[PDB]
């Protein structure tokens, strides 16, 4: 629950464009999500997410 917080975000991050490849979602939308995942503070959100969720 702490690995995917970055692994999932980073893995899906690189897949985003691959998705557009076989989905035709929206290159523009893809970029938006890249930022949604690129956010440094975000990595802190998922890190703390499992940190508290796991300690509890």
């Amino acid at each position: 629950g702490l690995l995917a917080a970055e692994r999932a975000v980073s893995q899906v991050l690189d897949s985003l464009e691959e998705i557009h490849a076989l989905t035709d979602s929206s290159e523009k939308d893809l970029d938006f999500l890249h930022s949604v995942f690129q956010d440094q503070h975000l990595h802190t959100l998922l890190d703390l997410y499992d940190k508290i969720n796991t300690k509890s």
């Binding site: 995917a4 999932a8 998705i19 503070h41």
Partner: protein, 60 residues
């Protein structure tokens, strides 16, 4: 980011639905990861905190 997160995890949800079922099953699992972790009860918790709680990480 709260609105960007829901729009991100929401987009990913639709993406996985139209992603897998071809040759990206595992990748599908990746998307749902971001979906659950995003919409998670705890996730929305730290995001709300960020409103005025700059988490200055230093070792983690």
């Amino acid at each position: 980011r709260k609105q960007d997160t829901q729009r991100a995890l929401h987009l990913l949800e639709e993406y996985r639905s139209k992603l897998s079922q071809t040759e990206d099953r595992q990748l599908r699992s990746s998307i749902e990861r971001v979906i659950s972790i995003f919409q998670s009860n705890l996730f929305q918790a730290l995001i709300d905190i960020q409103e005025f709680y700059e988490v200055t990480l230093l070792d983690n």
